[PDB]
Structures are given as structure tokens and as C-alpha cells.
From a paper:
The large superfamily of labdane-related diterpenoids is defined by the cyclization of linear geranylgeranyl pyrophosphate (GGPP), catalyzed by copalyl diphosphate synthases (CPSs) to form the basic decalin core, the copalyl diphosphates (CPPs). Here, we used X-ray crystallography and cryo-EM methods to describe different oligomeric structures of a syn-copalyl diphosphate synthase from Oryza sativa (OsCyc1), and provided a cryo-EM structure of OsCyc1D367A mutant in complex with the substrate GGPP. The structure of monomer OsCyc1 consists of an αβγ domain and a catalytic center located between the β and γ domains. OsCyc1 catalyzes GGPP to form syn-CPP, in which new bonds form between C6 and C11, as well as between C10 and C15.
To determine the structure of OsCyc1, we used the stable N-terminal truncation variant of OsCyc1, OsCyc169–767, from which the plastid targeting peptide was removed. Next, we determined the crystal structure of OsCyc169–767 by molecular replacement method at 3.5 Å resolution, which contains six protomers (Chains A/B/C/D/E/F) in the asymmetric unit. The overall structure of monomer OsCyc1 is similar to that of AtCPS, AgAS and SmMDS, with RMSD values for Cα of 1.86 Å, 2.15 Å and 1.94 Å, respectively. As the crystal structure of OsCyc1 was solved at a higher resolution than its cryo-EM structures, particularly in the γ domain region, we focused on utilizing the crystal structure to analyze oligomer interactions. Residues located within or near α22 interact with residues in α25, such as Q627 with R720, which are at a hydrogen bonding distance in the crystal structure. The interactions between α23 and α24 include R652 with Q675, as well as E640 with K686, possibly through van der Waals interactions. In addition, we found that H-bonds form between S674 and E677 within the α24 helix. When we analyzed the binding interactions in the crystal structure, we found that the interactions between different dimers are similar. The interaction between dimer C/D and dimer E/F is identical to the interaction between dimer A/B and dimer C/D, suggesting that a pseudo-twofold symmetry axis exists between the chains C and D. In addition to the abovementioned interactions in the center of the hexamer, a linkage exists in the γ domain of protomer B and protomer E, which protrude to the edge of the crystal hexamer structure. In the crystal structure of OsCyc1, the distance between the d1-oxygen in D367 and the d2-nitrogen in the conserved N414 is 2.97 Å.
Author numbering:
A (entry chain B): 81 to 116, 121 to 184, 195 to 452, 457 to 694, 696 to 767
B (entry chain A): 79 to 767
The structure:
């Protein structure tokens, strides 16, 4: 409990960003001379963050580009100000011996050229040096200088290595805070070249905000929120921070642009990674968002990361787009349709290859996203897996320096999640152990599977994988119980021929569900209808699965005790229409599992193609958080259907390997 | 006036009772033969003879003046003689018409094989014996009789001492002539009013031979309430009610008497037995004609009834009219069960299913035939009644069509009934019923044309013909006609036109929507299109939402396989309910579910319906279509259940609205366009009177 409050106070205090200080950008800001050093606290930061091998940068992850480039950039500060020559050469040793990332081949050449303007014994004569110094010109050539001055671009992030540019038409391109694409390095060098006080103002605040020392990117108010939400959400503890999450999710909605989302509010250049993350979470949490904001990253069928700079697209952004395409609504622009296909192909061509590199388990995160589309993504399934995939402090981010995200790439995030999940597994085992008794002492295993522990186990598991909450135990057990009766009864009819020869008064049977003073009567009425559905759908070809599901949501709605006001006309329609979809969607599923007869891949792929279709209009009506039906009622429909889909799209082998991994393979 | 005629039928319906039936000369003169109880020499009921004298027909016959039947005139005519002569009074008129028997007796040989009177072959030979005794000049040696005489004896072979005297049979109706019977075991058999199978005649013979004063009360009861004179069967409290309802219902004017009908329909529910129904409350032998009528009308009017009472009349594969006795089945009783078999619910005992199958076949063997005469009724247009129910099953039976047709089929005062004598039922087979129904129907047609011109104007004024059907002129006509054939009432104009308008708009938009391929290529908004349908401001809020919801359904069901015909049906019923401004006030959980299910079934039925009408002209296969026809028919039963079960908490009017919309979709899919406008012509344009 203390931990939840820990994450809460961290989220309530959300802001510009929790980022690690970058050694390179801090010393490059140290290089700015008094307006009459200008930030002696940049230097005061520098002296202390020296690693024992005499080097700099990220300590916990050793990277060549990072330890070298961060180390020397601190050196070019200490010696060019002729102070602390003790550590200055002590780290000059590190550079010499280990001489054998973003903007690396642009900021490093201007940093050696800057190393020449001082004296510093460093192997410039490196065979590795010529290969990346050649790419200096291999890129400064494909960049059109007259285009770098016309529209804000990703290049403006590396102006320390840029030579002889028109600042008259460049200051027109900065971010809203005055920064040059949010690099303090690019703004320091832009200030050495022009004294724009709004371009200074970005810099001083960044050092004031950190009491010395400055990161490699700022601010990142959007990226951080979006990703902190997705992370808490996947970890299953999102329910604890509902006001805080909906607090900053609002912020993302406020700053939605028709051109997409950037990593910060005040960056005019947008990227697909942030837009897809934003689009998914905004739609997932019930906001009105239009996916057409994506066609800004489509150029002739292909999907890049920036609007124009057709760079090679990385792996993580395509994952995040693929996920956003999974919340496809039928009324949406086709761009989301095209996006799904492209991103699936991108990640499939790469799945069978270790070319999944960009974080702890990025292939596992991706296998899931591809093997379990939305219709079959049960939140506890994803969450159990995600505990074994979330990197914690292990995740590192590739910027100008190696940097880390304090707020959402946290170790407290895991300790909290694995706690809340263990208590779920504990509450789950006691839950079913109580269920097993209930099943047996009812002469109820005589009906059902030829191994009723298996028909019980999956029937309880589905309900708990979806309605997993602490207190919602009333509903969960109700779902499991009613499910078992329905399975039992369907089994009895299947090997007897129908209610035609129902010798018994099997209406009763609900009295196997314990009497609640508010629950029992209405549950009798719903169960009566499921029976009445059998005798009518009996001597025909329509399946009953549609009505089995419809009964379920009816009970789950009786437990948990919310009713649908029926005087209001649109309240009636939205409910009555949700039932139609669930009745229709589960009936089509039961037709696919019959064609798996077992022949015609062409025919099965037709049924799948249209179930996905009807699922979209359901997913729309369930998430559309303005609809006149209670969000919990809407979730109840989504829960039942997803579980039905889950079952219909999964081998019994895969299904209980999940059961073992979520309920029994204890975390912590 | 129209109001008076409705009041005429009404005040008569309030005064319903034991029967309004016509007097029988035969049953009456047989009661004059009963000598005074107080040991006096005047006949016990002198008012029977008072009646005799007054109604001798001009040819000296007796019986039905308006309908001449030989069998009818002989038995009623001589029975009056064997009365008048047996008291040796009025021998002057006794003779005039004694010759009628003399001259026309030979003609007994011509009668229509099919409709011979009841107990004719038992009660007429019994009447030679009473004439022989009074010694009358009669052709007892008529060769025409030998055929009925000796086929009495073989008729009178199914008499056993053991069965006639242990459990009641219909022979008890005609024991006027019967020898060597043991009344001690026979009185244990009669009906509750004391009659012998409700025959005043048979009860008189049972009185000459048994002084049973608790059975006399029955005869005195008839003679007081009919002021002398006596019907050929009494009482008819169940039959008369059942038939008055079916007639007023098919004549389309049931609604004016909703209270009156629901009164005596209650009278039937109270007296429903697991053995079936008879024509009276107090007759232990039940018959399929009354039992079938009661079941249908009861289930039609929202009563809980179980068809399993029908297997009381199933005798291994066949459907007779009585429980014990297996007899040649007549036409009207099979028609009336067949009509009842149309209301099968999916929960029913199977016998109602099988009966449908039998009488369909029974009536088919007979449709292509001279045989269509009934043994029970002689009605103006009896095959037309059978035509419709045979061609138009429940799902496609629109109430205004049936009623239009029935107006030219109801015989009115012309219908005559076959008992021991020809008798008539004045109450529900009269001319005021027809005069009234045609009135209520003409005022329906007049208002129909007036509305039509409003539709024609409205369709124009909205420019919606730009993309109607091919000829929007008939897509208008039919879409009004479907709505008017169903919601036809006086007041309901609000809903009807709204139905027609919303149907036209919806179809119009769907037409254009197909033209271009979906909203993907739609430059237009269309959301505000309903403002083309007139509407009060204290209503526009919900009609917009229903339409917006329908469009959302379009965008979903596009580039998919499911049709929208379901959702257009939902849209209509949703719209009609808005125009009638009733919503489901606030119900418990099963109220919501029950509504949600009607929407489900309606949408599901109409998709399945529009799945055959494209697989019609496409990949034929009679068996592939019977798969769809089966699948639609099933859903209809569960829906027909959910509409008609009058215990439900959803308003009657909401449920009926679902049936109207679905029935109209059915009518269209199952009707040749050639026939469909013949109906349109006949109900809206081919005016009655």
C-alpha cells in the first residue's frame, strides 16, 4: 500500500520530465562565457560525476559511444577553462586507451575539431575514426542546406557540428520554448552564434531547474505522460491512479494537433511514435480521436516516423502504431487500415530475426501484440507477461547521450505491480478452491466436461482474467458459476437431443447459485430466458453461444447491481444494440470453431475477416466514453466477448499454459 | 349512422347469453306432445302449439322459410302434424301440408349427399312410427326412404348397450326414436343443465319415459325464455361467444368492442377444460371446432393456452372432431383448427405442429374438388375463407387485407346452420355486422386516399425521388400501404404516415447509399436528413437519435455481409414508437431484456428474410431456400410468442408494433409483386359500398 501512494505522489507531481543529467550537454553549456563561466554550476556538476575509471556518462550501462563522447566533452570544458587538470587528464587516459547513437557522426567531428583547438593527446589516428568522419560528409551532403533553413527538422538537434548557417532564417524554426529541437547543446552553440534572449531563457531555466547539470533533451511533458500511462496500464495497476491518469491524459487531449504529437507540447515537428501512443491511449480511455492524423506519415504506401524526413523507421514506433491500429473503429479513415497491414508486415519480416533491436524484453512485448490481437487480449494475460518484460531500471534510451527515465522506467513500478499481482493470484487460488467445492457438492460434475476440473478451471479463469479487481469478487464468481451451469446444461442437451426430450425441471438449477436478497430473483429471470432461448433456437441451425454470452453479461450486471435506466430512449437503444452485437459476434465465432468439416482455409479466413469487422463496431460502442451507458456496463460486454473470442482463437494447450502462468506460476 | 351500428353491435354484445338461435319446428312440436304434469289433458306447455299455429309456411311446410331444404321441410312439417293431429286440433291446416308431405316426399331422394341433417337417419324413421299410429295418409312406401331406413339400422349398429349407457356419446342428441334403453344408467350421462346432449327433443323423449323434474326444468327453461317454441340445440354459450369474436375480429371492428370481447373471452378462459370445449359450458363431450376456435382466439388475445388439448382428438395420425367417436371429418372444423395451428409458439406440445400438417393436407385434397360443402354450415363464401388461410399464413397475413377479403366473404344473414333442423344464429350472423364493418372500412379507405395525397405531396416537396426506387411512384405507394394495412386505426394517423415517411426516407438514403458504395465515398452529411419528416419539437430529440443510430449501423454493416434490412426494421419500429410517444416507463431487468430481444429477433428475421430474396433470383435450389424459409419461420414463432403473450410488462402497443413491422417485411418477401398491388388496389381503391 505504501508503494501505491509512492507512485501516486510521483504522478501527481508530473511535469516537464524526470530525466538523467547528460554529461555532454552539461559541459557544452559550461563553455558559455560570462555575459560581462556563465553557469559555474554546470561545472560544479561536472567535477563530481566522474566515474572511477576516469570516465563519464551513464554508469549503469557501459556503451562505447556514450562513455567516450560524454567523457571528452567534459574534458574540453575542464581544460579549456584550465581548472581541475587532475581529473582532466585522468579521464584523458580513458579516452586514449578505449578509443576502439543519435547525431553521433555530426557532433563528434565538431568535438574533435574542438579538441584540436586545445592540446590533448588523443588517438585521432584511429581506423574507426575515418569511417564515421566519412559519414560526417555522407550526411552533411544529403542534407539540403536551403531546406534545413525552411522547415523545422530533426537536424536542428545537432547544430554543434553544423557549420556556417543563416541564423536569420533559422531562429524562425525553433521550438516554442526557444530551443533548437530541444537540445541544450544545439541551443548553446546557437547562442554562441546569436544572443537571442528567448534562446538564452531556455538554457538558464534548464540549469536552474536542475541546480547545475542539464540533460540531452528537454522538455518532454508529452512523451513522459503517454509512456507512464501505457506502462502503468500494462502493469495492471492503472485502476489505482484513475484520477491522476485521467488528469494528464486530458493534457494529451489538450495538446492534440492535426499534424500529430511530438515528444513535447512545444515542438512543432511531430513523430509517429508519440502520435500512435497518444492515439491509442486517448481512444482507449474514451476520448474522441481521429486516426487521420496518421496520414501525415504515409508517403506512397509507406509509413515513416517523421513528416518528411523519410528516415529508416525503427522497431519500437511500429509496435506502437500496430497497437494503435488495433483499436480500429469502422468509421475511421482508412489510414489506420493501411497502417495495420504495413506495421504487421514490418514486425513479421523481423520476428524470425534477432533484428528486433532498437529495453529488457522487446521481442516478448511484440510476440504478444501480434499473437493476441485486441479481440483476444485479456488484461491479466498481458499483465502477467508484462511483469516478466518490464525492464525497470534496465531500460535505457538512445539519445545524444545514454539517458534514463526516472518516472516511468522505475524499480518501484515493478515492486508495486508484482505485489498487486501476487495478491491477485492468492485471492484467485482461494477463489477457485471455494469454487471447486461449489461445483462438486452440486452433483454438477456429473454434467459437463469429461474432466470437469478442466471445464471449471477455464470457466473460472476467463472470468478472473477479465474482472480481476479486488472487490469485484461478487461478479467474478457469479460469472464463473453461471458459466458452469450453462456449460453443464448445454452438455446435457447435446447428448440427449434437446429440450424436446428434457425430462427434467432444469429451470430451477440456479438455486445452485447462493441466495442473495437482491441477486437471486433477477438471476432466475435471466436464466429462465437462456432456457427459453434453447427451445426456440432448438430445432434450427442458429447456435446458442450468442445467448450463452448474452446471459452472462446479464448476470454480471445483476451482480454488481447496476441497472440500465429504461425510460431514456437512447439508454435503451445503446443497451439493446450492444446485446445484438454480442449475440451476433459470439454466434459467428461458434461457426468458425465448427469449420475448424475442418477444411477450407479460405472459408475460415472469411469468417475471421467478418468477426473482426463486427468486433470493431462493438469496440467502438464500448469505449465511446460519451455513450449513454455506464462505463462499467460497457466493460461487461467487452469482457464477455473478449473471453469468448479468446477461447475460440486458442488451443486448449495454449489456454492453460496461460492458466498456469497467470494463476499458479507465482510472481514474487 | 355508423355510431349507432357500433352501438347496435355493442349493446347486443353486452347482453350475450345462452344463445340467440332460431326456433325449430321439429324440436318444438315434439315438446307439445308432453302431457300435463298435474294429470291434466291439456299439453304441458300450450305455448309450443301456440307457436306451431302461427308459423306455417305458405306451401304448408314448416322450417326455414328463407332456405328450402327437402330433409328440413319434411321432418319439421310432419312433426307439426303429428303434434296437431295428436291433440286433434286445427285439423284443417293439419291437412294443408299433410299433402305437402304427400307430394314432396319422393324428393327426399335428391338431397345433397354432403349436408344431410343431424340424426336424420334415426329421427325420421322414428317419425313414421308416430304417423302410422295416428294413421295418416303418407307414402310410408316411398322408395326414396328405403335408403335411409336400412342405413339407420347399420348406423344404429355402433350402438352397444355397453358404450351408449356408460359414457356420453352424441347419440344422446337424437334418441327421440330409440327402443329398449335403460334410463337408470342413462340419466348418469346427461349435460349439466339436464338436457340429453343439449337436444330439447331428446330430453322430451327422455321425459315421456322418466318423470325427472330436474330435467324438465331444462325444457321449461327453454319454453319460458323463447315464449313458446324451442331451438334444435341449446344452450350455445361458448360457441356463440367464440363465433361472435372471430367474426367481429375478421370484420376488423373488434377494436370498438375491446371491452366487450375481453369480457366474454374471459368467459371462455374460465371454462377452458383439459378435455376441450363444447358448444356449451355444460357438455362433457368436446369438439375440435369449438376447441380449436377457443384456443386460437384466446391465444390471439394474449391469453395463456396450451395446445396439448388437441391430442384429445388425435387418433393415430388423424384428427377427428370428437374424442371417442372417429367420424368423417368435415371442412369447417379442419379450417378452424388449421387457422389455430398458425399461432404455434416454439415451446408448444408437438400436436399443434402435426395438426397443421394434417389439415393443410386435408384441405388440399378438398380444395381441388367439388367437395367444399360443409356438414355444419352453409355460408356465402366458404372456399374464400379457406383460400386465404391456405395461401396467406400468419407471418404474411396483414389485418386490413384479410378484413378487405372477408367483407366479400361474410354471408351475414344468409348463413344457415345444420342441426336436427336448419337453424340460424341471429346474434353474430346478421346483416348489421356486415353493414357496420363496411362502414368502418369505407371511412378507412377515405382517410387512406387523403393520407396518400399527403405522402405524394410530401415525397415531392422533399425532392426525395431524385434517388427513390426505379419508379419511386410505387415504392411510395407500397410503403404507405404496408403501414396502412397494419396500423389502420382512426387515431393512429400520426404513426402510420410517420412509418411511411421514415420508410421512404430510409429506403431513399439506402438507394443512394448503394449507388455510390458507402459513406466512404459520401460527400454529404445526411445526419440532419430526418428534419424532412414533420415533427413536434417535444419529440425531435429522440427521432434524430434513432436515425443517427441507423446511419451508424450503415457505416458498420457496409463492406460486410450482413444486411441493413434488420436495422431499417429496427429504425421503423423505433420511429413508430416515437410517433406514439410511449416508452417503457421504468421496468425491472426482464422488461429491458424482453425489449432487447424484440429488437434482436426483428433484426435477425429481416436479415434472414433479405437473405432468401437475394438467393431467390441467384443460386436457386428449392432445398437451399427451404433452409432459409425454415429458419425464418422458426424465429417468427418465438417472436409471435413474445408479441402475443399478454402477461408481458411491455405495453401491448409496443409489442404489436414489432409484429406490424416484421409482418410487413414478410409480406413483401413472400408475395408476387403482381399480387401485392392487387391487394393495394383491393384494400385502398376498390371501395366497398
Amino acid at each position: 500500500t505504501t508503494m501505491i501512494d509512492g507512485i501516486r505522489t510521483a504522478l501527481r507531481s508530473i511535469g516537464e520530465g524526470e530525466i538523467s543529467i547528460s554529461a555532454y550537454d552539461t559541459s557544452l553549456v559550461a563553455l558559455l562565457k560570462r555575459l560581462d563561466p556563465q553557469f559555474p554550476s554546470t561545472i560544479d556538476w561536472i567535477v563530481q560525476n566522474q566515474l572511477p575509471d576516469g570516465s563519464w556518462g551513464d554508469a549503469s550501462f557501459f556503451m562505447m559511444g556514450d562513455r567516450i563522447m560524454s567523457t571528452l566533452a567534459c574534458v574540453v570544458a575542464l581544460k579549456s577553462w584550465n581548472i581541475h587538470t587532475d581529473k582532466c587528464e585522468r579521464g584523458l587516459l580513458f579516452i586514449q586507451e578505449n578509443m576502439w547513437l543519435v547525431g553521433f557522426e555530426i557532433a563528434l567531428p565538431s568535438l574533435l575539431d574542438m579538441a584540436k583547438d586545445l592540446d590533448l593527446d588523443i588517438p585521432y589516428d584511429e581506423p574507426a575514426l575515418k569511417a564515421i568522419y566519412a559519414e560526417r560528409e555522407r550526411k552533411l551532403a544529403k542534407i539540403p542546406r536551403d531546406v534545413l533553413h525552411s522547415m523545422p527538422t530533426t537536424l536542428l538537434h545537432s547544430l554543434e557540428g553544423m557549420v556556417d548557417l543563416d541564423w536569420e532564417k533559422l531562429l524562425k524554426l525553433r521550438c516554442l520554448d526557444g530551443s533548437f529541437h530541444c537540445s541544450p547543446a544545439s541551443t548553446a552553440t546557437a547562442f554562441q552564434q546569436t544572443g537571442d534572449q528567448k534562446c538564452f531563457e531556455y538554457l538558464d531555466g534548464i540549469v536552474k531547474k536542475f541546480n547545475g547539470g542539464v540533460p540531452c533533451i528537454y522538455p518532454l511533458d508529452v512523451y513522459e505522460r503517454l509512456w507512464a500511462v501505457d506502462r502503468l496500464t500494462r502493469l495492471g495497476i492503472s485502476r489505482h491512479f484513475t484520477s491522476e491518469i485521467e488528469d494528464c491524459l486530458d493534457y494529451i487531449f489538450r495538446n492534440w494537433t492535426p499534424d500529430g504529437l511530438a515528444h513535447t507540447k512545444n515542438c512543432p515537428v511531430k513523430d509517429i511514435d508519440d502520435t500512435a501512443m497518444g492515439f491509442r491511449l486517448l481512444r482507449l480511455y474514451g476520448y474522441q480521436v481521429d486516426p487521420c492524423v496518421l496520414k501525415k506519415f504515409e508517403k506512397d504506401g509507406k509509413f515513416f516516423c517523421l513528416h518528411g524526413e523519410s528516415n529508416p523507421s525503427s522497431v519500437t514506433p511500429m509496435y506502437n502504431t500496430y497497437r494503435a491500429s488495433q483499436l480500429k473503429f469502422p468509421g475511421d479513415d482508412g489510414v489506420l487500415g493501411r497502417a495495420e497491414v504495413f506495421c504487421r508486415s514490418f514486425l513479421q519480416d523481423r520476428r524470425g530475426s534477432n533484428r528486433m533491436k532498437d529495453a529488457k524484453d522487446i521481442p516478448g512485448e511484440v510476440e504478444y501484440a501480434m499473437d493476441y490481437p485486441w479481440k483476444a487480449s485479456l488484461p491479466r494475460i498481458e499483465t502477467r507477461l508484462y511483469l516478466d518484460q518490464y525492464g525497470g531500471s534496465g531500460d535505457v534510451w538512445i539519445g545524444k547521450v545514454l539517458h534514463r527515465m526516472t518516472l516511468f522506467c522505475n524499480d518501484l513500478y515493478l515492486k508495486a505491480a508484482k505485489a498487486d499481482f501476487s495478491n491477485f493470484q492468492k485471492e484467485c487460488r482461494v477463489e477457485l478452491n471455494g469454487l471447486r467445492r461449489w461445483y462438486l457438492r452440486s452433483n454438477l460434475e456429473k454434467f459437463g466436461g469429461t474432466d470437469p476440473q478442466t471445464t471449471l478451471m477455464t470457466s473460472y479463469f476467463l472470468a478472473s482474467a477479465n474482472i480481476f479487481e479486488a472487490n469485484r469478487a461478487a461478479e467474478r464468481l457469479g460469472w464463473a458459476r453461471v458459466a458452469l451451469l450453462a456449460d453443464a446444461v448445454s452438455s446435457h442437451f447435446r447428448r440427449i437431443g434437446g429440450p424436446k426430450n428434457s425430462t427434467s425441471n432444469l429451470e430451477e438449477l440456479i438455486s445452485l447459485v447462493p441466495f442473495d436478497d437482491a441477486y437471486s430473483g433477477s438471476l432466475r429471470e435471466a436464466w429462465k430466458q437462456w432456457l427459453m432461448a434453447w427451445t426456440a433456437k432448438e430445432s434450427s441451425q442458429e447456435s446458442i453461444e450468442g445467448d450463452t454470452a448474452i446471459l452472462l453479461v446479464r448476470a454480471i450486471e445483476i451482480f454488481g447491481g447496476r441497472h440500465v435506466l429504461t425510460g431514456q430512449r437512447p439508454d435503451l437503444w445503446e443497451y439493446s444494440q450492444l446485446e445484438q452485437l454480442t449475440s451476433s459476434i459470439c454466434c459467428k465465432l461458434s461457426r468458425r470453431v465448427l469449420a475448424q468439416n475442418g477444411e477450407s482455409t479460405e472459408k475460415v479466413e472469411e469468417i475471421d475477416q467478418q468477426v473482426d469487422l463486427e468486433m470493431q463496431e462493438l469496440t467502438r460502442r464500448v469505449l465511446q466514453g460519451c455513450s449513454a451507458i455506464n462505463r462499467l456496463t460497457r466493460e461487461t460486454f467487452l469482457h464477455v466477448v473478449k473471453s469468448f473470442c479468446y477461447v475460440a482463437y486458442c488451443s486448449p494447450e495454449t489456454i492453460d499454459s496461460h492458466i498456469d502462468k497467470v494463476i499458479f506460476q507465482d510472481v514474487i
